[PDB]
Amino acid sequence: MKMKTKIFRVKGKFLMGDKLQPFTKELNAIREEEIYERLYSEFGSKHRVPRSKVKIEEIEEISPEEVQDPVVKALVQRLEHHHHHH
Numbered sequence: 001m002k003m004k005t006k007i008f009r010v011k012g013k014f015l016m017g018d019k020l021q022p023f024t025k026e027l028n029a030i031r032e033e034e035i036y037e038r039l040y041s042e043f044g045s046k047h048r049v050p051r052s053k054v055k056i057e058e059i060e061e062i063s064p065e066e067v068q069d070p071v072v073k074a075l076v077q078r079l080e081h082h083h084h085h086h
């Protein structure tokens with residue numbers, strides 16, 4: 001069943017150069033089984049980081065308008081209501 005997408009503010013570590021770098025990823029999904037696969041996909045895409053080297057530590061569900069990432073916040077708004085301002 002599809003719904004209004006939940007923005008999960010993930011806070012974890014990714015292994016690059018045998019070093020753990022911390023990240024704060026605000027991404028819109030439906031459930032946790034999405035979050036894992038979507039991050040393994042993104043880090044591999046944008047950053048070319050291997051899946052087994054991406055370590056998720058925290059997953060915090062936040063509100064659509066509170067999201068700091070402009071791209072994700074714009075993505076969530078695509079399924080929202082066009083504010084009728086005459």
